Design a protein around this ligand. Structure first.
Ligand SMILES: [Mn+2]
Ligand SMILES: [Mn+2]
Ligand SMILES: [Mn+2]
Ligand SMILES: [Mn+2]
Ligand SMILES: [Mn+2]
Ligand SMILES: [Mn+2]
Ligand SMILES: [Mn+2]
Lengths: 425, 434
């Protein structure tokens, strides 16, 4: 197993990071709580389990509640593994790096936790549970900030997991793309994606966005239309995948016919998107790229005669935000919108990323151009009304909008666009 | 017809509300749909699950921050959440029965709620939120018990919704069955079910159980094997569907070849299952049927020579529970395991389970317009079989035959049946699911 070799280095890195912070904050150790199952109100049914990101940072156990990791960075990390033996229920490489204790029932954990928890930092969601167990330090900000800062630097093990994540997601994206050109409904396209990725809905790192025509302009679109539209014009799919707790996050936009103004508009955004990806470089502030994206959107708006102005004028008047209202992208890893994106240092001192770009960091680059009713209405109420080609806006509105998103690893002397290296056009 | 039936539904809920607020000296009742739960340290959210007490009034189950204010005399007030931000996209029959006011942001609901919330009962999950608004009565038990008791009596509207929920589920079960005989994996079978029901995973009222071979013996099996088994022997699917907040809950078990001892075992269990369905009748304690199920499971174990005893002997020695460890079934409606099933009166008193089965919680006396599941089972579970082998009943068990039947896992057959005054309506088998 190639992962096993890399994982040995991963643990050693986390141990080193753990040593530094527990010594700095004068702690005996850190306790990571995987989480618990949430029960639905007045019911005996449960929400799907979502593991604490700080927990799965150590190991690929993301489907098991009531698990505990006790670490100080010097000794082997203690893993309290939940494993019920009741009759209604029911070894790998990472197992050898932990001292594993089996937990048969949730409230039996206290006998397995350290006796004096005065200087053990509880890292988890369930503060009432932590207090009941005797923990007093819960998610200490210096500790959270330290881990979150270094989470931006992915180990070789993590990079491998994120590559496999894209690989699965790209398979889904190609299958979804094929379903679109066959005239399938949003629901059917989603089924094709889930089938190709072999993912259940709750396996996807975020709710898939599967939008046809006007629905493409809906930034937080979640629904899946069961009925295919009479006419197929555009398709926007924002979807990813999971591998070992690590996420992919990819968006592609398609014109149905492959020709016409919207088809050219998509391709223009593509060339801009690729150009923005290749601007990723160590020592460079991510905010610089976001600014350049606005320039490129303004040029696009100008070239396609959507706004009757030059690119620089569109930027100065603040018109671009009407068509591109969100951030250029974000760090990605264990979390889709990964932590540490705003941090200037370990202490912890719209756009989701402003942090200086360094090697071993992973980003998304997702420029967008949309025709959104409420935003266009606001623009029409300003003095910029005169500058807008409203006829052109009316022409492109039925196509909804455009977003193109890749996941890129930044290396010291090169860039690794995982998504496009997997040949997803 | 649904629009017509819904008028009577609202009238019924109004009258129930009038009775309970008068009895408990209340000004009204507030039903909170709930909120979206955010994942720890993240900006991703859990799927929204609506408060059952809220969707009891209306078919709005995908909307948080909604509030219903009712006293049973005036029209029920519906505070409907409907944001206008540019990230979101911005009149059915049920709308006319509510005085609707739109809520654009969740923290603006206080302006729409009653001024004096002292005698207004808050029915919701978010206590500190309600306390912050001014509410003081948090899910008062006499109010909870009263509503939950009468929740057992489904209105004509609710029955119609449950028929449709069952109609959808059966379409899935047929597609799943076909996939099984085509030799597909558990994951592929689940995909077929979701497609045929046009359900997303989070639309299903519970996590589907799609089990092949030995997995059929796992009662709380949740995984979906991506790899098809090299040998195809058995298939158990426990799966339902949603319509307007109401649930279906259906189980079927299949033998792959349709021949052999396990195939005959499934066939025998089916005839028992149908017979148990027809035992549903007004005036009977549900525990009476549970007892008969154990008798029939014992008879099956005896006839197939799995246990070398008569049916009475197997029951008396408490051996049946090794092969049939759970309850015969439950009330079903807005919730899969619906409320009120253990209540003797509307005060919340418990109808005690029959002797020998202290863990049976569906015990309430059967009446018309109540909806039940009938799910007898016969499984071969390692843990329970191990327990049996350690007892003095070890000598009575045909262990060689058990070993031959173990790779097939187990059997469960489940329908959803409406009890009427004169007849029984097996919704599942009416929809032509063998
Ligand atoms: Mn120190
Ligand atoms: Mn210090
Ligand atoms: Mn995305
Ligand atoms: Mn993204
Ligand atoms: Mn041009
Ligand atoms: Mn069931
Ligand atoms: Mn059931």
């Amino acid at each position: 197993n190639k992962l096993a070799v890399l994982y040995a280095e991963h643990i050693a890195t986390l141990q080193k990071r753990t040593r530094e912070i527990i010594e700095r904050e004068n702690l005996d150790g850190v306790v990571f709580h995987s989480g618990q199952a949430k029960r639905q109100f007045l019911d005996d049914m449960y929400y799907p389990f979502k593991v604490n990101p700080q927990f799965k940072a150590w190991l690929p156990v993301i489907d098991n509640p009531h698990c505990w990791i006790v670490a100080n960075g010097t000794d082997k990390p203690k893993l309290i593994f939940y494993r019920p033996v009741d009759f209604w229920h029911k070894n790998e490489y990472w197992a050898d790096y932990f001292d594993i204790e089996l937990l048969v029932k949730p409230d039996q954990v206290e006998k397995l936790l350290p006796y004096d928890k005065a200087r053990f930092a509880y890292i988890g969601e369930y503060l009432e549970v932590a207090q009941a167990l005797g923990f007093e330090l819960m998610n200490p900000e210096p500790v959270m900030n330290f881990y979150h800062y270094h989470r931006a630097y992915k180990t070789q093990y993590e990079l491998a997991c994120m590559r496999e994540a894209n690989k699965i997601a790209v398979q889904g994206h190609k299958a979804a793309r094929d379903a679109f050109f066959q005239g399938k409904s949003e629901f059917e396209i989603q089924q094709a994606y889930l089938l190709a990725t072999q993912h259940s809905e709750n396996d996807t790192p975020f709710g898939n966005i599967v939008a046809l025509n006007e629905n493409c302009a809906i930034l937080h679109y979640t629904h899946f239309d069961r009925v295919a539209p009479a006419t197929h014009r555009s398709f926007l799919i924002d979807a990813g995948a999971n591998f070992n707790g690590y996420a992919a996050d990819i968006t592609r936009t398609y014109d149905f016919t492959g020709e016409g103004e919207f088809a050219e508009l998509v391709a223009t955004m593509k060339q801009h998107q690729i150009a923005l990806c290749n601007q990723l470089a160590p020592g460079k502030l991510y905010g610089e790229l976001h600014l350049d994206c606005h320039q490129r959107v303004a040029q696009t708006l100008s070239d396609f005669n959507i706004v009757n102005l030059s690119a620089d004028e569109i930027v100065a008047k603040g018109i671009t935000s009407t068509f591109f209202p969100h951030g250029l992208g974000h760090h990605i890893g264990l979390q889709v919108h990964d932590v540490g994106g705003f941090m200037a240092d370990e202490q912890g001192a719209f756009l989701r990323c402003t942090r200086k770009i360094e090697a071993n960091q992973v980003f998304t680059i997702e420029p967008g151009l949309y025709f959104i009713d409420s935003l266009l209405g606001d623009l029409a109420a300003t003095d910029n009304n005169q500058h807008i080609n409203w006829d052109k806006v009316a022409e492109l509105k039925p196509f909804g909008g455009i977003r193109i998103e890749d996941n890129i690893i930044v290396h010291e002397d090169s860039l690794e666009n995982m998504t496009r290296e997997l040949e997803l056009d």
